[PDB]
Design a protein around this ligand. Structure first.
Ligand SMILES: COc1cccc(C[C@H]2C[C@H]3Cc4c(cccc4OC)C[C@@H]3N(C)C2)c1
Lengths: 27, 357
């Protein structure tokens, strides 16, 4: 499915971004 | 079927009474930190904090010394060294200003762009890589750490009229641009040429790359100005004058985005998100961080929201957000990082806060 596969790519790639946001050093 | 519900909890109007063209929440602030958004319009840049019970707390405002300046866009980043937030702004004067939000002062500026800057975007992985799209038909990639112009995307096979919008994909490997020439163009930044160009801007007059040829080009989606473009995974969402956001992809239904050749002639229209009374140029659509929601304001002050997790773009429709005092054109909307708040900015300098239910 075009939808199911595209949704999984968004899921994995936003997860990678979210992890980087979580890890981010401050002050 | 869509489940998302919102309640209008507050509104205000900025004293300049001029159109607000841009709104952006800071998606870099960490969990628990105050929810902050910036608005842009006229010669002003304004910061607000979102508090409980729909309270919208004014933090500070930047008033440009040039009264004739009209800001069109803003984008958030962070200083990779100090870790503190930074805000980029630009418009009609073609000058990129890097504001420190703590003091709301211009700490460095970039000139060069032949004219007005229509949109700014920060790279999703590198906080130093700023993309600007201009009235001069070109896109420019900047490194705000070394103050270098990494690349100019335009020329021989570049845009033929104003570049109106552009978006990096999720991993920051490629940009999709759009404008007044009706075309959407692909620019790969994960090429050996570009990766080395970026690496060289960090080693640093610097010699900018001139990217005359895009990696894909189509004029088969819209029949008027393309004012907004955003990636949806490997697919693209774009809009024009025509009351629809079109979901499409370069090549054939089964073709891979990374297997597309620069001469590819096919496009596949996967779907259309239909709405009404948004037949005026210069109206942005937005998505939330997880790309589960899609929002667009119309010219009579109605706010459309769709559920991107429902396959058919007819059943995807949420209930339209409306308020009898909100009748002016909604130029742009912004979701807070956690999708709990939706801000809409208008042609009459009004701001509207909608909290999720
Ligand atoms: C908010 O969505 C946008 C989508 C794409 C690009 C932009 C920046 C644009 C702002 C435009 C505003 C405008 C123009 C002419 C007459 C009245 C006007 O204001 C009601 C020309 C400007 N344009 C060429 C650049 C905004």
């Amino acid at each position: 499915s075009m939808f199911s596969s595209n949704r999984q790519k968004i899921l994995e790639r936003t997860e990678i971004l979210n992890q980087e946001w979580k890890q981010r050093r401050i002050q | 079927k869509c489940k998302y519900s919102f309640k209008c909890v507050n509104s205000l109007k900025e004293d300049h009474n001029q159109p607000l063209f841009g709104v952006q929440f800071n998606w870099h602030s960490k969990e628990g930190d105050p929810l902050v958004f910036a608005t842009v319009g006229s010669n002003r840049v304004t910061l607000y904090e979102c508090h409980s019970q729909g309270e919208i707390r004014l933090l500070q405002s930047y008033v440009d010394a040039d009264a004739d300046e009209n800001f069109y866009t803003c984008a958030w980043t962070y200083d990779s060294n100090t870790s503190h937030p930074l805000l980029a702004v630009a418009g009609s004067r073609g000058i990129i200003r890097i504001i420190n939000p703590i003091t709301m002062q211009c700490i460095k500026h970039y000139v060069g762009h032949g004219n007005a800057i229509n949109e700014l975007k920060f790279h999703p992985r590198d906080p130093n890589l700023l993309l600007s799209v201009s009235k001069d038909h070109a896109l420019r990639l900047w490194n705000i750490q070394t103050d270098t112009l990494v690349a100019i995307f335009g020329g021989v096979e570049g845009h033929r009229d104003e570049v109106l919008s552009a978006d990096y994909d999720l991993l920051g490997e490629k940009i999709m641009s759009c404008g007044m020439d009706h075309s959407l163009k692909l620019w790969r930044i994960n090429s050996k040429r570009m990766m080395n160009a970026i690496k060289e801007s960090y080693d640093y007059p610097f010699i900018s790359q001139k990217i005359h040829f895009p990696d894909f080009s189509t004029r088969d989606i819209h029949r008027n100005y393309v004012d907004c473009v955003r990636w949806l995974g490997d697919l693209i969402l774009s809009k024009s004058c025509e009351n629809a956001i079109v979901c499409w992809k370069p090549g054939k239904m089964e073709d891979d985005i990374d297997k597309i050749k620069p001469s590819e002639s096919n496009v596949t229209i996967l779907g259309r998100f239909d709405y009404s009374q948004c037949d005026i140029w210069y109206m942005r659509f937005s998505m939330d961080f997880w790309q589960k929601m899609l929002a667009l304001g119309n010219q009579v002050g109605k706010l459309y929201v769709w559920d991107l997790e429902v396959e058919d773009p007819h059943k995807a429709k949420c209930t339209t957000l409306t308020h009898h005092k909100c009748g002016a054109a909604i130029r742009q909307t912004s979701f807070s990082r956690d999708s709990s708040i939706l801000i809409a900015v208008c042609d009459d300098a009004s701001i509207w806060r909608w909290d999720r239910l």
